[PDB]
Amino acid sequence: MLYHLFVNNQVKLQNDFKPESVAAIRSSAFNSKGGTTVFNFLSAGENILLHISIRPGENVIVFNSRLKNGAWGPEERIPYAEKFRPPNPSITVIDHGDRFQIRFDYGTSIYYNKRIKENAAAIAYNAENSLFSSPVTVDVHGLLPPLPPA
Amino acid sequence: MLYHLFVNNQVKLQNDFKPESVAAIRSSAFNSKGGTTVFNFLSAGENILLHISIRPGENVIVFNSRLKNGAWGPEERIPYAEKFRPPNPSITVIDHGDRFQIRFDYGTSIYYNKRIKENAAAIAYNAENSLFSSPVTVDVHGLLPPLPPA
Amino acid sequence: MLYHLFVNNQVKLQNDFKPESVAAIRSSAFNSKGGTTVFNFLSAGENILLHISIRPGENVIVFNSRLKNGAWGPEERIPYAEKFRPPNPSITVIDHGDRFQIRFDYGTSIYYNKRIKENAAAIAYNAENSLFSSPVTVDVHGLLPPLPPA
Amino acid sequence: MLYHLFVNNQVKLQNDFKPESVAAIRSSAFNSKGGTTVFNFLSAGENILLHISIRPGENVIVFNSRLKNGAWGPEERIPYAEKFRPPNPSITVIDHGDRFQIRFDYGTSIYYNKRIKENAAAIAYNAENSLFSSPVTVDVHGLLPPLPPA
Ligand SMILES: CC(=O)N[C@@H]1[C@@H](O)[C@H](O[C@@H]2O[C@H](CO)[C@H](O)[C@H](O)[C@H]2O[C@@H]2O[C@@H](C)[C@@H](O)[C@@H](O)[C@@H]2O)[C@@H](CO)O[C@H]1O
Numbered sequence: 001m002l003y004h005l006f007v008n009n010q011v012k013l014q015n016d017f018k019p020e021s022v023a024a025i026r027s028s029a030f031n032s033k034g035g036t037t038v039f040n041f042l043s044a045g046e047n048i049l050l051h052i053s054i055r056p057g058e059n060v061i062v063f064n065s066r067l068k069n070g071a072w073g074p075e076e077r078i079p080y081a082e083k084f085r086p087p088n089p090s091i092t093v094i095d096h097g098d099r100f101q102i103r104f105d106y107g108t109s110i111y112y113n114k115r116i117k118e119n120a121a122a123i124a125y126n127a128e129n130s131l132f133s134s135p136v137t138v139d140v141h142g143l144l145p146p147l148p149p150a
Numbered sequence: 151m152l153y154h155l156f157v158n159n160q161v162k163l164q165n166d167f168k169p170e171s172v173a174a175i176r177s178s179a180f181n182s183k184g185g186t187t188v189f190n191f192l193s194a195g196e197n198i199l200l201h202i203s204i205r206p207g208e209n210v211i212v213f214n215s216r217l218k219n220g221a222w223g224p225e226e227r228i229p230y231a232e233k234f235r236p237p238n239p240s241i242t243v244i245d246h247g248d249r250f251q252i253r254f255d256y257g258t259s260i261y262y263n264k265r266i267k268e269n270a271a272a273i274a275y276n277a278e279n280s281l282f283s284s285p286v287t288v289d290v291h292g293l294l295p296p297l298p299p300a
Numbered sequence: 301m302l303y304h305l306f307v308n309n310q311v312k313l314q315n316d317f318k319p320e321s322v323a324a325i326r327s328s329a330f331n332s333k334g335g336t337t338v339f340n341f342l343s344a345g346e347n348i349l350l351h352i353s354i355r356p357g358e359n360v361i362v363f364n365s366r367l368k369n370g371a372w373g374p375e376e377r378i379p380y381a382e383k384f385r386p387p388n389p390s391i392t393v394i395d396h397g398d399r400f401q402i403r404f405d406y407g408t409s410i411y412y413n414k415r416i417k418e419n420a421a422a423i424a425y426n427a428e429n430s431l432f433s434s435p436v437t438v439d440v441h442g443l444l445p446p447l448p449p450a
Numbered sequence: 451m452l453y454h455l456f457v458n459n460q461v462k463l464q465n466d467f468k469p470e471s472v473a474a475i476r477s478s479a480f481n482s483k484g485g486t487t488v489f490n491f492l493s494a495g496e497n498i499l500l501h502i503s504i505r506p507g508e509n510v511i512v513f514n515s516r517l518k519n520g521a522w523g524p525e526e527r528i529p530y531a532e533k534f535r536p537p538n539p540s541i542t543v544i545d546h547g548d549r550f551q552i553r554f555d556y557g558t559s560i561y562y563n564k565r566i567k568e569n570a571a572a573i574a575y576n577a578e579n580s581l582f583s584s585p586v587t588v589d590v591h592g593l594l595p596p597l598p599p600a
Pocket residue numbers: 051053062063064072074075
């Protein structure tokens with residue numbers, strides 16, 4: 001299923017993002033002078049199941065979670081540098097049941113153990129000065145699709 | 151290369167759409183009550199190399215061409231019905247050198263002999279009440295990419 | 301539909317190879333010092349709808365057609381000039397209704413106007429010293445599948 | 451990278467099968483009355499990093515590991531219960547660093563925690579009466595490739 005997720009907005013998923021689900025987020029642009037950009041996978045109750053804070057100025061990408069009116073837990077970080085590929089950078093998130101796998105353009109995957117046992121009903125996108133385009137293209141799969149030879 | 155083509159607007163291609171090029175246009179929605187929707191492949195000089203007029207009310211899809219200040223030539227038509235697949239209908243255009251191949255979700259391809267020997271520098275999207283989303287996602291390939299088993 | 305086509309053998313297609321059909325042939329190797337290698341798309345009646353003779357020595361690729369017990373028609377040749385990318389070279393054939401499109405790893409697409417109005421029911425592979433592996437992996441589609449962004 | 455893995459044989463990988471690596475195994479047939487079929491991911495030192503024993507009779511799939519001249523470790527089994535889609539069944543194995551992900555045509559992904567900290571250098575295929583074709587088509591990726599919208 002294809003969605004167009006606009007900045008400082010979100011998209012309500014047709015079906016819940018759950019185990020086996022794959023979300024391929026792709027930007028039509030890369031604004032090198034952009035600021036902190038965030039993507040949140042939210043449950044129906046608006047709990048932040050997966051928070052991805054891309055911070056170029058801090059050279060880090062922070063992952064976390066928290067209930068709608070709860071507090072962030074410990075942060076999980078990785079260097080920002082050498083992760084995205086202009087002019088069409090991408091973010092791929094896969095739900096492996098007990099944890100999410102996040103993959104950017106380069107480098108190894110990031111694995112984030114789930115902290116809230118719920119499926120995502122929406123994906124939000126927030127940024128004052130986004131690093132990516134608005135909207136960003138999002139393809140959500142119920143399961144990993146057949147793969148091309150390359 | 152990924153582009154976000156908004157309705158009643160266009161996208162300037164990074165490189166020209168020419169022989170071997172493949173443009174995959176995908177909508178995030180299908181507005182059954184939408185009207186006539188158009189996609190034009192334009193040259194640098196703004197000549198309409200390939201005009202695709204999707205007319206639900208007339209139950210037809212019209213293909214044509216014309217110079218920037220020229221006249222349409224003869225029309226090439228196909229029934230509108232059973233061509234698109236909601237909620238993510240698509241249009242795939244392939245430049246075969248001497249003609250374009252246009253493929254929708256269902257049915258056989260449409261072949262349109264080129265009438266203007268030029269490459270496209272832009273793709274335009276026009277509609278009063280579009281049948282598709284705004285923007286529509288557009289992936290342009292320099293050549294047919296590797297194919298998945300299905 | 302996946303088939304394993306062995307050298308000096310053939311594979312019977314579960315479905316007619318006809319307009320919109322795509323055959324993605326892939327080899328697990330490239331035998332540098334290989335000799336003339338042939339791929340034929342045959343009708344159920346064993347007419348050779350599309351003959352592809354890749355000749356390293358003569359440095360040409362000959363395309364032709366012929367009825368079961370008939371003689372070869374006029375040849376349509378092009379220079380061989382390094383069309384394959386080792387170690388996994390590919391040959392993709394697409395049925396466009398009035399003609400076939402043949403794409404290798406390099407060079408431009410080759411177009412061959414159909415000479416016999418029949419669909420292919422089998423693909424044959426012949427060679428004394430094949431340029432490719434035995435068997436070759438063959439994925440046949442009834443229509444062009446959705447494409448990855450790259 | 452494409453390989454043709456023959457039954458009761460193996461294929462030496464041009465590159466280490468390691469974190470981020472994906473092995474897409476595809477069969478050109480499904481032998482209904484086939485017997486126990488095995489696929490092993492081996493280290494260059496011939497340690498069995500991941501053993502996959504598909505047993506129709508016992509109706510289970512056993513996953514295990516073992517050093518070259520060592521004994522099998524504790525078994526991790528699941529019911530076989532119709533995991534393959536004829537006539538072209540598939541097995542996809544992904545290296546996630548601390549564990550392997552194995553996906554069949556049906557059922558959920560199977561996760562197997564790594565028991566040996568080595569990368570795979572070869573994939574073996576064993577069976578007296580294989581459930582699948584010989585050889586099986588194997589596409590190995592260094593990283594998950596861009597995905598088609600479907
Ligand atoms: C190393 C460390 O622990 N630094 C902490 C920052 O990462 C925290 O920032 C907040 O982090 C959460 C995720 O854990 C989320 O990304 C918040 O949006 C983020 O807060 C924003 O960004 C900060 C840099 C501040 O400008 C803040 O005002 C913003 O609202 C902060 C706050 O929890 O604590 C640091 O110790």
